[PDB]
Amino acid sequence: TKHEISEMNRMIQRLRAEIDNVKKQCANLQNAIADAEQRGELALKDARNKLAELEEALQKAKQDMARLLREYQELMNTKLALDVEIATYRKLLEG
Amino acid sequence: TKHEISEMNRMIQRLRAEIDNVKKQCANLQNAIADAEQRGELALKDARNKLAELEEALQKAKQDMARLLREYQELMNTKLALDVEIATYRKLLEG
Amino acid sequence: SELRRTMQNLEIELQSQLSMKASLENSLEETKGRYCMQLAQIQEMIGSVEEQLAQLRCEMEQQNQEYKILLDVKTRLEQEIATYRRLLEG
Amino acid sequence: SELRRTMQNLEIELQSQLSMKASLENSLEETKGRYCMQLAQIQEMIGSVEEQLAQLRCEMEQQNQEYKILLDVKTRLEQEIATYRRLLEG
């Protein structure tokens, strides 16, 4: 056992060596994770803004298209209004 | 129990109704999954090509830079070659 | 034996750590994909809206052109009426 | 009872299905993130190489300019030598 000992002492050395190592690794993973969360939470905040930016833009467009279509109908009206005057001004010139 | 029955018969109806429903859902998830795999496997193939395309391009550049640096040194040489001739052609003109 | 005991206890402690580490690794992968997906999803929404918006903007352009067409007719008619209202008293 | 029995068996069968479905849902999420990440990774490699390549191409340009500078000197020297080799016998 005088030798068995030397091998156990060397194992203990190997063992704490790695235990202490894994502890470092864990600590790093721990960071890794916090960074990913921070990094990701941000990217989402970014995206969620661009979205609301668009969302607003789209509502504005929707309204302008509303108005455009209304402006067209008014024009169409007053146009036909003249279609009349013309037809009547014609008859008056074929007498 | 003449009533308990009607309630059990209606439960059985509700039960098969949903069992058969979940079965549809499962079948769809099943598809969902196959599509994702097919779709993804492809996107990776795409990327893995662009990569190898670049990889090749980069090696080509690396070689041209190799050649460029060599071409420079040859020029630098023949340049100093003239630095001599000039210095010597000078002395000959200060006599 | 008392030596063998503390060596074995260390063998065990290494295992704890080793486990704790493994689940920590998987937890990290989990986190990473999670955000990856969540992001992908919003990216897609934005795509849809961008194109929804674009599609609309294109249609507003088409509208404006149509209005122009109509308007050109309208003003022209005004100049017919003008020459009619001319020939009558002239 | 024989009725109650078949109703309960169905209650159980629903549970099976319900479970099988749940794990199928999670399996799908797993798949999706997996590819999402794997893709993200390669995307990044490509980024690195693109920029590695770009950086290089920029440096090749700088080199070419430097060569031009040197070359202009070289040809000029040739024209000094030419006027020296001129004044001597002239």
XYZ file of C-alpha atoms in Angstrom:
370
model
C 0.000 0.000 0.000
C 3.056 2.271 0.270
C 2.671 2.532 -3.497
C -1.131 2.266 -3.692
C -0.907 5.446 -1.661
C 1.227 7.384 -4.159
C -1.369 6.478 -6.781
C -4.246 7.641 -4.586
C -2.442 10.894 -3.754
C -1.928 11.483 -7.488
C -5.605 10.686 -8.167
C -6.751 13.162 -5.519
C -4.488 15.676 -7.259
C -6.003 14.841 -10.672
C -9.450 14.932 -9.112
C -9.359 18.339 -7.456
C -7.553 19.603 -10.516
C -10.543 18.737 -12.691
C -13.231 19.540 -10.125
C -11.793 23.025 -9.892
C -11.709 23.099 -13.670
C -15.338 22.136 -14.250
C -16.175 24.870 -11.750
C -14.561 27.424 -14.100
C -16.421 25.992 -17.059
C -19.742 26.175 -15.222
C -19.006 29.790 -14.278
C -18.419 30.584 -17.942
C -21.567 28.855 -19.153
C -23.282 30.940 -16.533
C -21.968 34.085 -18.230
C -22.639 32.702 -21.704
C -26.281 32.383 -20.676
C -26.673 35.862 -19.168
C -25.137 37.409 -22.301
C -27.478 35.504 -24.583
C -30.468 36.679 -22.562
C -29.314 40.279 -22.501
C -28.356 40.163 -26.183
C -31.620 38.515 -27.216
C -33.921 40.614 -25.049
C -32.454 43.571 -26.882
C -32.802 42.226 -30.444
C -36.481 41.611 -29.644
C -36.901 45.171 -28.331
C -35.348 46.397 -31.576
C -37.692 44.314 -33.705
C -40.758 45.225 -31.633
C -40.061 48.893 -32.403
C -39.572 48.466 -36.140
C -42.882 46.627 -36.019
C -44.807 49.379 -34.242
C -43.110 51.836 -36.618
C -44.456 49.923 -39.599
C -47.772 49.360 -37.867
C -48.250 53.109 -37.638
C -47.021 53.703 -41.202
C -49.519 51.141 -42.470
C -52.438 52.813 -40.721
C -51.425 56.119 -42.265
C -51.322 54.577 -45.742
C -54.679 52.907 -45.141
C -56.146 56.358 -44.398
C -54.603 58.064 -47.405
C -56.038 55.320 -49.607
C -59.385 55.992 -47.925
C -59.124 59.674 -48.811
C -57.863 58.993 -52.355
C -60.864 56.846 -53.201
C -63.160 59.557 -51.867
C -61.425 62.225 -53.941
C -61.902 60.033 -57.014
C -65.634 59.673 -56.533
C -66.084 63.453 -56.205
C -64.196 63.925 -59.450
C -66.197 61.179 -61.163
C -69.346 63.013 -60.084
C -68.546 66.457 -61.317
C -67.325 64.768 -64.500
C -70.700 63.201 -65.306
C -72.172 66.594 -64.383
C -70.496 67.892 -67.532
C -71.546 64.872 -69.553
C -74.991 66.316 -69.105
C -74.225 69.911 -69.964
C -72.483 68.676 -73.119
C -75.395 66.473 -74.271
C -77.798 69.371 -73.742
C -75.450 71.955 -75.333
C -75.356 69.584 -78.325
C -79.095 69.394 -79.005
C -79.105 73.196 -78.926
C -76.591 73.139 -81.807
C -78.512 70.707 -84.022
C -81.570 72.802 -84.727
C -79.746 5.580 -14.296
C -82.133 5.995 -17.245
C -80.800 9.549 -17.281
C -77.245 8.825 -16.099
C -77.175 6.824 -19.304
C -78.110 9.709 -21.616
C -75.257 11.650 -20.026
C -72.801 8.793 -20.531
C -73.910 8.333 -24.149
C -73.350 12.063 -24.722
C -69.923 11.854 -23.039
C -68.886 8.941 -25.251
C -69.985 11.107 -28.178
C -67.939 14.074 -26.891
C -65.054 11.725 -26.199
C -64.715 10.047 -29.580
C -65.368 13.418 -31.141
C -62.243 14.827 -29.508
C -60.142 11.667 -29.723
C -60.706 11.693 -33.457
C -59.856 15.375 -33.426
C -56.538 15.086 -31.597
C -55.693 12.384 -34.129
C -56.025 14.984 -36.918
C -53.909 17.444 -34.983
C -51.187 14.854 -34.420
C -51.232 14.017 -38.134
C -50.708 17.692 -38.926
C -47.875 18.152 -36.450
C -46.392 15.138 -38.144
C -46.456 17.017 -41.456
C -45.322 20.262 -39.839
C -42.224 18.392 -38.685
C -41.378 16.739 -42.013
C -41.691 20.108 -43.781
C -39.401 21.807 -41.294
C -36.795 19.092 -41.778
C -37.023 19.213 -45.551
C -37.063 23.019 -45.549
C -34.145 23.277 -43.129
C -31.998 20.561 -44.681
C -32.219 22.613 -47.842
C -31.358 26.019 -46.336
C -28.241 24.371 -44.879
C -27.303 22.898 -48.274
C -27.683 26.388 -49.731
C -25.470 27.943 -47.075
C -22.868 25.166 -47.288
C -22.450 25.982 -50.988
C -22.112 29.737 -50.568
C -19.474 28.868 -47.990
C -17.428 26.604 -50.254
C -17.856 29.252 -52.968
C -16.334 31.869 -50.690
C -13.772 29.403 -49.401
C -12.470 28.962 -52.929
C -12.622 32.701 -53.684
C -10.588 33.396 -50.555
C -7.862 30.948 -51.530
C -7.643 32.600 -54.930
C -7.273 36.040 -53.346
C -4.667 34.690 -50.936
C -2.633 33.520 -53.953
C -2.945 36.763 -55.881
C -1.729 38.627 -52.801
C 1.173 36.168 -52.701
C 2.032 36.990 -56.306
C 1.537 40.751 -55.833
C 4.043 40.904 -52.999
C 6.534 38.980 -55.118
C 6.050 41.339 -58.056
C 6.710 44.264 -55.714
C 10.014 42.905 -54.480
C 11.272 42.375 -58.049
C 10.395 45.966 -58.855
C 12.024 47.217 -55.653
C 15.167 45.360 -56.708
C 15.546 46.655 -60.201
C 14.757 50.083 -58.753
C 17.744 50.091 -56.392
C 19.726 48.748 -59.357
C 19.225 52.172 -60.917
C 19.968 53.960 -57.669
C 23.447 52.653 -58.253
C 23.804 53.573 -61.896
C 22.630 57.089 -61.015
C 25.112 57.562 -58.138
C 27.943 56.388 -60.386
C 26.746 58.429 -63.407
C 26.805 61.419 -61.031
C 30.437 61.179 -59.922
C 31.347 60.996 -63.610
C 29.666 64.400 -64.067
C 31.418 66.149 -61.171
C 34.968 66.036 -62.443
C -8.920 3.429 3.709
C -9.420 6.893 5.143
C -7.377 8.015 2.158
C -9.358 5.794 -0.216
C -12.506 7.322 1.282
C -11.608 10.935 0.543
C -10.486 9.980 -2.965
C -13.836 8.338 -3.627
C -15.759 11.264 -2.199
C -13.859 13.414 -4.701
C -14.756 11.012 -7.502
C -18.365 11.614 -6.474
C -17.987 15.391 -6.197
C -16.506 15.459 -9.678
C -19.665 13.695 -10.873
C -21.932 16.328 -9.302
C -20.000 19.106 -10.984
C -19.916 17.137 -14.213
C -23.690 16.794 -14.124
C -24.387 20.365 -13.054
C -22.187 21.373 -15.975
C -24.027 19.217 -18.527
C -27.472 20.587 -17.678
C -25.938 24.055 -17.768
C -24.710 23.369 -21.302
C -28.159 22.234 -22.387
C -29.776 25.174 -20.632
C -27.549 27.412 -22.730
C -28.539 25.670 -25.963
C -32.176 25.989 -24.915
C -31.852 29.727 -24.289
C -30.067 30.235 -27.617
C -32.629 28.475 -29.790
C -35.479 30.068 -27.857
C -34.375 33.605 -28.666
C -33.340 32.489 -32.153
C -36.934 31.314 -32.842
C -38.732 34.154 -31.040
C -36.667 36.536 -33.157
C -37.337 34.620 -36.408
C -41.066 34.932 -35.689
C -41.048 38.713 -35.297
C -38.734 38.985 -38.296
C -41.483 37.236 -40.242
C -44.265 39.505 -38.955
C -42.214 42.484 -40.053
C -41.831 40.843 -43.436
C -45.606 40.465 -43.756
C -46.316 44.040 -42.745
C -43.545 45.473 -44.930
C -45.085 43.733 -47.934
C -48.642 44.458 -46.841
C -47.531 48.090 -46.674
C -45.636 47.924 -49.951
C -48.533 46.267 -51.781
C -50.758 49.088 -50.535
C -48.304 51.836 -51.536
C -48.146 50.344 -55.011
C -51.951 50.435 -55.193
C -52.033 54.041 -54.033
C -49.757 54.835 -56.945
C -52.070 53.063 -59.397
C -54.964 55.042 -57.888
C -53.195 58.376 -58.364
C -52.589 57.553 -62.008
C -56.248 56.675 -62.480
C -57.225 59.969 -60.864
C -54.913 61.744 -63.307
C -56.600 60.050 -66.271
C -60.030 61.070 -65.031
C -58.854 64.603 -64.261
C -57.497 65.066 -67.781
C -60.859 64.129 -69.196
C -62.608 66.487 -66.805
C -60.607 69.552 -67.757
C -60.972 68.751 -71.433
C -64.754 68.581 -71.129
C -64.569 72.027 -69.556
C -62.946 73.290 -72.758
C -65.630 71.729 -74.957
C -68.346 73.368 -72.898
C -66.293 76.547 -73.293
C -66.403 76.394 -77.082
C -70.108 75.500 -77.034
C -70.923 78.410 -74.734
C -68.954 80.306 -77.369
C -70.576 79.301 -80.652
C -74.060 80.023 -79.326
C -73.799 83.779 -78.751
C -71.037 84.230 -81.339
C -71.428 -0.269 -15.592
C -70.466 -1.875 -18.878
C -71.395 1.484 -20.361
C -69.498 3.368 -17.651
C -66.531 1.112 -18.423
C -66.322 1.947 -22.119
C -66.761 5.646 -21.349
C -63.851 5.523 -18.926
C -61.679 3.593 -21.346
C -62.342 6.420 -23.809
C -61.404 8.986 -21.170
C -58.115 7.099 -20.917
C -57.623 6.820 -24.680
C -58.158 10.552 -24.989
C -55.328 10.995 -22.478
C -52.939 8.851 -24.535
C -53.678 10.874 -27.640
C -53.454 14.080 -25.645
C -50.012 13.089 -24.405
C -48.750 11.786 -27.735
C -49.870 15.124 -29.148
C -48.046 17.213 -26.529
C -44.682 15.518 -27.054
C -45.263 15.882 -30.785
C -45.731 19.625 -30.300
C -42.502 19.874 -28.331
C -40.694 17.700 -30.850
C -41.740 20.213 -33.489
C -40.450 23.157 -31.454
C -37.208 21.252 -30.921
C -36.759 20.621 -34.646
C -37.511 24.267 -35.459
C -35.005 25.802 -33.063
C -32.407 23.195 -33.984
C -32.394 24.150 -37.654
C -32.796 27.813 -36.707
C -29.536 27.644 -34.677
C -27.593 25.384 -37.057
C -28.448 27.871 -39.796
C -27.497 30.915 -37.670
C -24.090 29.307 -37.096
C -23.287 28.827 -40.781
C -24.673 32.289 -41.504
C -22.043 33.559 -39.080
C -19.190 31.576 -40.652
C -20.132 33.056 -44.000
C -20.073 36.474 -42.390
C -16.539 35.881 -41.102
C -15.251 34.632 -44.431
C -16.981 37.382 -46.418
C -15.230 39.971 -44.260
C -11.975 38.031 -44.141
C -12.181 38.038 -47.937
C -13.212 41.680 -48.125
C -10.448 42.799 -45.760
C -7.975 40.975 -48.000
C -9.376 42.464 -51.224
C -9.046 45.914 -49.701
C -5.405 45.168 -48.865
C -4.735 43.924 -52.381
C -5.980 47.277 -53.604
C -3.643 49.144 -51.247
C -0.808 46.926 -52.518
C -1.549 47.725 -56.163
C -1.439 51.428 -55.391
C 1.902 51.026 -53.641
C 3.227 49.131 -56.653
C 2.072 52.011 -58.853
C 3.964 54.525 -56.705
C 7.135 52.464 -56.907
C 6.698 51.906 -60.644
C 6.384 55.635 -61.304
C 9.659 56.220 -59.538
C 11.296 53.414 -61.482
C 10.386 54.737 -64.906
C 11.422 58.237 -63.920
C 14.863 57.031 -62.853
C 15.143 55.456 -66.291
C 14.696 58.920 -67.802
C 17.371 60.446 -65.569
C 19.823 57.747 -66.571
C 18.759 58.540 -70.137
C 19.739 62.193 -69.837
C 22.993 61.274 -68.077
C 23.908 58.767 -70.779
C 23.152 61.747 -73.007
C 25.225 64.566 -71.532
C 28.354 62.417 -71.436
C 28.879 61.821 -75.160
C 27.017 64.987 -76.179
